[PDB]
Amino acid sequence: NSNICEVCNKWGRLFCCDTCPRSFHEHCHIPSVEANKNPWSCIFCRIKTIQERCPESQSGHQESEVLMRQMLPEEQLKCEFLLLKVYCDSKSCFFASEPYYNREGSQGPQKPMWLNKVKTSLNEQMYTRVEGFVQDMRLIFHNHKEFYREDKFTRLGIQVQDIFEKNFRNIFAIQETS
Ligand SMILES: [Zn+2]
Ligand SMILES: [Zn+2]
Ligand SMILES: [Zn+2]
């Protein structure tokens, strides 16, 4: 196994996947690494299994259909993985914890949002459809763009949104377009 966490790239108390060489901090993995379970398979492995069991799950889909899907176990897993892929980028630090807004010439968002809140929401089964999760993810970046206006820091929102959107299209097998 790797000697660093796959998500944050640090050493520490790591839990090792039994079916691949990745390792994780307990609360870096999503869901948090399970108490018992020998062998244990990480989220990467669990997502690969879904694909292998249903190869046709990789044919192209329309985003509108994906969003309306109910959060059954497989869609719950896919959203957990997509959230984890965002955390894997170091620029996610900016969006992880609860933000506050006090900048001359701007007003804070009406509905603040952040990664750890989405994380808790998934853990608590608060989303009934994929759309719920995706709307909250996109709101994080949209809030950021609006608040920071012409400051160059706005680009951090663009950057992390692009990681989200690429991973969304991959994980949910969105039909490729120009
Ligand atoms: Zn970690
Ligand atoms: Zn694994
Ligand atoms: Zn099948």
PDB file of C-alpha atoms and ligand atoms in Angstrom:
ATOM      1  CA  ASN A   1       0.000   0.000   0.000  1.00  0.00           C
ATOM      2  CA  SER A   2       0.863   3.688  -0.414  1.00  0.00           C
ATOM      3  CA  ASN A   3       2.405   5.421   2.664  1.00  0.00           C
ATOM      4  CA  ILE A   4       0.442   8.663   2.177  1.00  0.00           C
ATOM      5  CA  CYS A   5      -3.322   9.412   2.260  1.00  0.00           C
ATOM      6  CA  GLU A   6      -4.813   9.400  -1.252  1.00  0.00           C
ATOM      7  CA  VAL A   7      -6.910  12.505  -0.542  1.00  0.00           C
ATOM      8  CA  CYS A   8      -4.580  14.902   1.397  1.00  0.00           C
ATOM      9  CA  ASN A   9      -1.207  13.386   0.466  1.00  0.00           C
ATOM     10  CA  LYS A  10       0.037  13.367   4.083  1.00  0.00           C
ATOM     11  CA  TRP A  11       1.271  10.488   6.244  1.00  0.00           C
ATOM     12  CA  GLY A  12      -0.318   9.692   9.580  1.00  0.00           C
ATOM     13  CA  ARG A  13      -2.729   7.004  10.889  1.00  0.00           C
ATOM     14  CA  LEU A  14      -3.658   5.391   7.535  1.00  0.00           C
ATOM     15  CA  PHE A  15      -6.162   2.605   6.741  1.00  0.00           C
ATOM     16  CA  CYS A  16      -5.147   0.496   3.787  1.00  0.00           C
ATOM     17  CA  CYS A  17      -7.407  -0.737   1.006  1.00  0.00           C
ATOM     18  CA  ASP A  18      -7.425  -4.546   0.672  1.00  0.00           C
ATOM     19  CA  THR A  19      -8.127  -4.522  -3.036  1.00  0.00           C
ATOM     20  CA  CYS A  20      -5.913  -1.721  -4.263  1.00  0.00           C
ATOM     21  CA  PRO A  21      -2.740   0.008  -3.001  1.00  0.00           C
ATOM     22  CA  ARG A  22      -4.454   3.223  -1.780  1.00  0.00           C
ATOM     23  CA  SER A  23      -4.501   4.403   1.791  1.00  0.00           C
ATOM     24  CA  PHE A  24      -6.611   6.856   3.809  1.00  0.00           C
ATOM     25  CA  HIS A  25      -6.962   8.876   6.871  1.00  0.00           C
ATOM     26  CA  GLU A  26     -10.126   7.858   8.632  1.00  0.00           C
ATOM     27  CA  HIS A  27     -12.094  11.075   7.890  1.00  0.00           C
ATOM     28  CA  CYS A  28     -10.439  11.725   4.537  1.00  0.00           C
ATOM     29  CA  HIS A  29     -12.199   8.679   3.057  1.00  0.00           C
ATOM     30  CA  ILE A  30     -15.868   9.207   2.326  1.00  0.00           C
ATOM     31  CA  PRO A  31     -17.766   7.562   3.898  1.00  0.00           C
ATOM     32  CA  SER A  32     -15.348   7.616   7.024  1.00  0.00           C
ATOM     33  CA  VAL A  33     -13.322   4.373   7.060  1.00  0.00           C
ATOM     34  CA  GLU A  34     -15.561   1.640   8.477  1.00  0.00           C
ATOM     35  CA  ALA A  35     -14.817   0.286  12.075  1.00  0.00           C
ATOM     36  CA  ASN A  36     -14.420  -3.390  11.264  1.00  0.00           C
ATOM     37  CA  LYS A  37     -14.726  -5.017   7.748  1.00  0.00           C
ATOM     38  CA  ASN A  38     -11.848  -7.355   6.890  1.00  0.00           C
ATOM     39  CA  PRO A  39     -11.210  -7.270   4.024  1.00  0.00           C
ATOM     40  CA  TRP A  40     -12.009  -3.549   3.435  1.00  0.00           C
ATOM     41  CA  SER A  41     -12.406  -2.065  -0.001  1.00  0.00           C
ATOM     42  CA  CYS A  42     -12.112   1.746  -0.577  1.00  0.00           C
ATOM     43  CA  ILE A  43     -14.549   3.893  -2.523  1.00  0.00           C
ATOM     44  CA  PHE A  44     -12.394   3.745  -5.638  1.00  0.00           C
ATOM     45  CA  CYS A  45     -12.674  -0.063  -5.581  1.00  0.00           C
ATOM     46  CA  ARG A  46     -16.438   0.038  -4.852  1.00  0.00           C
ATOM     47  CA  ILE A  47     -17.048   2.384  -7.788  1.00  0.00           C
ATOM     48  CA  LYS A  48     -14.938   0.192 -10.124  1.00  0.00           C
ATOM     49  CA  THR A  49     -17.081  -2.827  -9.027  1.00  0.00           C
ATOM     50  CA  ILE A  50     -20.332  -1.042  -9.993  1.00  0.00           C
ATOM     51  CA  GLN A  51     -18.892  -0.421 -13.445  1.00  0.00           C
ATOM     52  CA  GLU A  52     -17.664  -3.988 -13.899  1.00  0.00           C
ATOM     53  CA  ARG A  53     -20.984  -5.428 -12.806  1.00  0.00           C
ATOM     54  CA  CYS A  54     -22.855  -3.216 -15.330  1.00  0.00           C
ATOM     55  CA  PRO A  55     -20.579  -2.300 -18.234  1.00  0.00           C
ATOM     56  CA  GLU A  56     -23.434  -0.474 -19.946  1.00  0.00           C
ATOM     57  CA  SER A  57     -23.467   1.985 -16.983  1.00  0.00           C
ATOM     58  CA  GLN A  58     -20.620   3.701 -18.866  1.00  0.00           C
ATOM     59  CA  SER A  59     -22.614   4.565 -21.966  1.00  0.00           C
ATOM     60  CA  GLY A  60     -23.418   8.264 -22.261  1.00  0.00           C
ATOM     61  CA  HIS A  61     -26.197   9.826 -20.223  1.00  0.00           C
ATOM     62  CA  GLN A  62     -28.037  13.126 -20.257  1.00  0.00           C
ATOM     63  CA  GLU A  63     -27.341  15.367 -17.252  1.00  0.00           C
ATOM     64  CA  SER A  64     -31.032  16.027 -16.842  1.00  0.00           C
ATOM     65  CA  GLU A  65     -31.770  12.322 -16.359  1.00  0.00           C
ATOM     66  CA  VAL A  66     -28.841  11.873 -13.943  1.00  0.00           C
ATOM     67  CA  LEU A  67     -30.009  14.772 -11.775  1.00  0.00           C
ATOM     68  CA  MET A  68     -33.503  13.349 -11.346  1.00  0.00           C
ATOM     69  CA  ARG A  69     -32.257  10.022 -10.096  1.00  0.00           C
ATOM     70  CA  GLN A  70     -33.246   9.073  -6.591  1.00  0.00           C
ATOM     71  CA  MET A  71     -30.447   8.637  -4.081  1.00  0.00           C
ATOM     72  CA  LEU A  72     -30.482   4.801  -3.910  1.00  0.00           C
ATOM     73  CA  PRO A  73     -27.273   3.145  -2.613  1.00  0.00           C
ATOM     74  CA  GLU A  74     -25.344   3.334  -5.912  1.00  0.00           C
ATOM     75  CA  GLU A  75     -26.124   7.031  -6.527  1.00  0.00           C
ATOM     76  CA  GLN A  76     -25.287   7.819  -2.851  1.00  0.00           C
ATOM     77  CA  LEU A  77     -21.914   6.127  -3.444  1.00  0.00           C
ATOM     78  CA  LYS A  78     -21.265   8.004  -6.666  1.00  0.00           C
ATOM     79  CA  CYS A  79     -21.969  11.372  -4.958  1.00  0.00           C
ATOM     80  CA  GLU A  80     -19.685  10.406  -2.088  1.00  0.00           C
ATOM     81  CA  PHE A  81     -16.907   9.595  -4.573  1.00  0.00           C
ATOM     82  CA  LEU A  82     -17.442  12.822  -6.529  1.00  0.00           C
ATOM     83  CA  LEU A  83     -17.242  14.813  -3.212  1.00  0.00           C
ATOM     84  CA  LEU A  84     -14.049  12.912  -2.412  1.00  0.00           C
ATOM     85  CA  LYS A  85     -12.507  13.781  -5.796  1.00  0.00           C
ATOM     86  CA  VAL A  86     -13.025  17.465  -4.963  1.00  0.00           C
ATOM     87  CA  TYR A  87     -11.291  17.081  -1.577  1.00  0.00           C
ATOM     88  CA  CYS A  88      -8.418  15.390  -3.400  1.00  0.00           C
ATOM     89  CA  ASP A  89      -7.466  18.801  -4.900  1.00  0.00           C
ATOM     90  CA  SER A  90      -5.494  20.910  -2.485  1.00  0.00           C
ATOM     91  CA  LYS A  91      -7.498  24.017  -3.532  1.00  0.00           C
ATOM     92  CA  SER A  92     -10.502  22.453  -1.799  1.00  0.00           C
ATOM     93  CA  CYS A  93      -9.154  23.916   1.469  1.00  0.00           C
ATOM     94  CA  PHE A  94     -10.754  27.220   0.536  1.00  0.00           C
ATOM     95  CA  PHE A  95     -14.223  25.742   0.290  1.00  0.00           C
ATOM     96  CA  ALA A  96     -14.132  23.120   3.111  1.00  0.00           C
ATOM     97  CA  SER A  97     -15.167  24.973   6.222  1.00  0.00           C
ATOM     98  CA  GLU A  98     -17.872  27.564   6.903  1.00  0.00           C
ATOM     99  CA  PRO A  99     -17.082  30.863   5.164  1.00  0.00           C
ATOM    100  CA  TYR A 100     -17.680  34.417   6.364  1.00  0.00           C
ATOM    101  CA  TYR A 101     -18.184  37.541   4.331  1.00  0.00           C
ATOM    102  CA  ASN A 102     -16.871  41.008   5.151  1.00  0.00           C
ATOM    103  CA  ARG A 103     -15.391  42.739   2.112  1.00  0.00           C
ATOM    104  CA  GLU A 104     -15.898  46.365   1.135  1.00  0.00           C
ATOM    105  CA  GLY A 105     -18.185  46.529  -1.881  1.00  0.00           C
ATOM    106  CA  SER A 106     -19.662  43.036  -1.605  1.00  0.00           C
ATOM    107  CA  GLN A 107     -22.475  41.413   0.216  1.00  0.00           C
ATOM    108  CA  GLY A 108     -22.375  37.778   1.382  1.00  0.00           C
ATOM    109  CA  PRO A 109     -24.494  35.104  -0.352  1.00  0.00           C
ATOM    110  CA  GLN A 110     -28.087  34.455   0.680  1.00  0.00           C
ATOM    111  CA  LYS A 111     -27.354  30.766   1.040  1.00  0.00           C
ATOM    112  CA  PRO A 112     -23.802  29.979   2.157  1.00  0.00           C
ATOM    113  CA  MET A 113     -22.460  26.523   1.337  1.00  0.00           C
ATOM    114  CA  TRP A 114     -19.304  24.599   1.949  1.00  0.00           C
ATOM    115  CA  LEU A 115     -17.790  21.114   1.445  1.00  0.00           C
ATOM    116  CA  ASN A 116     -18.037  19.935   5.065  1.00  0.00           C
ATOM    117  CA  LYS A 117     -21.751  20.885   5.062  1.00  0.00           C
ATOM    118  CA  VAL A 118     -22.308  18.766   1.899  1.00  0.00           C
ATOM    119  CA  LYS A 119     -20.327  16.026   3.571  1.00  0.00           C
ATOM    120  CA  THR A 120     -22.593  16.078   6.647  1.00  0.00           C
ATOM    121  CA  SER A 121     -25.648  16.258   4.433  1.00  0.00           C
ATOM    122  CA  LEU A 122     -24.630  13.108   2.577  1.00  0.00           C
ATOM    123  CA  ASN A 123     -23.784  11.311   5.795  1.00  0.00           C
ATOM    124  CA  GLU A 124     -27.219  12.174   7.216  1.00  0.00           C
ATOM    125  CA  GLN A 125     -29.060  11.042   3.981  1.00  0.00           C
ATOM    126  CA  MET A 126     -30.526  14.543   3.514  1.00  0.00           C
ATOM    127  CA  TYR A 127     -30.495  14.408  -0.261  1.00  0.00           C
ATOM    128  CA  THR A 128     -33.301  12.497  -1.975  1.00  0.00           C
ATOM    129  CA  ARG A 129     -32.079  13.011  -5.544  1.00  0.00           C
ATOM    130  CA  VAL A 130     -28.718  13.550  -7.223  1.00  0.00           C
ATOM    131  CA  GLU A 131     -29.939  17.062  -8.105  1.00  0.00           C
ATOM    132  CA  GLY A 132     -29.822  18.103  -4.344  1.00  0.00           C
ATOM    133  CA  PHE A 133     -26.196  17.209  -4.026  1.00  0.00           C
ATOM    134  CA  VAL A 134     -25.165  18.719  -7.376  1.00  0.00           C
ATOM    135  CA  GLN A 135     -27.048  21.999  -6.704  1.00  0.00           C
ATOM    136  CA  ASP A 136     -25.250  22.457  -3.323  1.00  0.00           C
ATOM    137  CA  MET A 137     -21.859  21.690  -4.952  1.00  0.00           C
ATOM    138  CA  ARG A 138     -22.419  24.190  -7.712  1.00  0.00           C
ATOM    139  CA  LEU A 139     -23.669  26.804  -5.235  1.00  0.00           C
ATOM    140  CA  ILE A 140     -20.329  26.688  -3.419  1.00  0.00           C
ATOM    141  CA  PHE A 141     -18.547  27.948  -6.513  1.00  0.00           C
ATOM    142  CA  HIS A 142     -21.240  30.314  -7.699  1.00  0.00           C
ATOM    143  CA  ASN A 143     -21.326  32.029  -4.217  1.00  0.00           C
ATOM    144  CA  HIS A 144     -17.555  32.449  -4.427  1.00  0.00           C
ATOM    145  CA  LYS A 145     -17.610  33.977  -7.944  1.00  0.00           C
ATOM    146  CA  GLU A 146     -20.284  36.428  -7.038  1.00  0.00           C
ATOM    147  CA  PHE A 147     -18.689  37.564  -3.730  1.00  0.00           C
ATOM    148  CA  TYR A 148     -15.136  38.052  -5.014  1.00  0.00           C
ATOM    149  CA  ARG A 149     -16.241  39.942  -8.192  1.00  0.00           C
ATOM    150  CA  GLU A 150     -13.128  41.180  -9.953  1.00  0.00           C
ATOM    151  CA  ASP A 151     -10.591  40.092  -7.364  1.00  0.00           C
ATOM    152  CA  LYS A 152      -8.280  37.538  -8.898  1.00  0.00           C
ATOM    153  CA  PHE A 153      -9.191  35.165  -6.028  1.00  0.00           C
ATOM    154  CA  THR A 154     -12.387  34.458  -7.980  1.00  0.00           C
ATOM    155  CA  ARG A 155     -10.277  32.100 -10.051  1.00  0.00           C
ATOM    156  CA  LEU A 156     -10.010  29.600  -7.200  1.00  0.00           C
ATOM    157  CA  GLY A 157     -13.781  29.009  -7.623  1.00  0.00           C
ATOM    158  CA  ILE A 158     -13.376  28.461 -11.351  1.00  0.00           C
ATOM    159  CA  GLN A 159     -10.543  26.065 -10.740  1.00  0.00           C
ATOM    160  CA  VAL A 160     -12.266  23.867  -8.158  1.00  0.00           C
ATOM    161  CA  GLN A 161     -15.555  23.974 -10.115  1.00  0.00           C
ATOM    162  CA  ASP A 162     -13.713  22.611 -13.131  1.00  0.00           C
ATOM    163  CA  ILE A 163     -12.460  19.666 -11.000  1.00  0.00           C
ATOM    164  CA  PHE A 164     -16.013  19.057  -9.828  1.00  0.00           C
ATOM    165  CA  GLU A 165     -17.541  19.204 -13.331  1.00  0.00           C
ATOM    166  CA  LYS A 166     -14.918  16.941 -14.972  1.00  0.00           C
ATOM    167  CA  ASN A 167     -15.379  14.353 -12.237  1.00  0.00           C
ATOM    168  CA  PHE A 168     -19.179  14.661 -12.440  1.00  0.00           C
ATOM    169  CA  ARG A 169     -19.084  13.916 -16.177  1.00  0.00           C
ATOM    170  CA  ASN A 170     -16.710  10.918 -15.571  1.00  0.00           C
ATOM    171  CA  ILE A 171     -18.435   9.344 -12.576  1.00  0.00           C
ATOM    172  CA  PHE A 172     -21.933   9.669 -13.964  1.00  0.00           C
ATOM    173  CA  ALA A 173     -20.920   8.849 -17.553  1.00  0.00           C
ATOM    174  CA  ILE A 174     -22.318  12.012 -19.037  1.00  0.00           C
ATOM    175  CA  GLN A 175     -22.515  11.865 -22.866  1.00  0.00           C
ATOM    176  CA  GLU A 176     -19.536  13.602 -24.388  1.00  0.00           C
ATOM    177  CA  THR A 177     -20.182  16.791 -26.430  1.00  0.00           C
ATOM    178  CA  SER A 178     -18.207  19.609 -28.141  1.00  0.00           C
TER     179      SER A 178
HETATM  180 ZN    ZN B   1      -5.826  12.419   4.467  1.00  0.00          ZN
HETATM  181 ZN    ZN B   2      -9.180   0.364  -3.117  1.00  0.00          ZN
HETATM  182 ZN    ZN B   3     -25.626  -4.892 -16.453  1.00  0.00          ZN
END
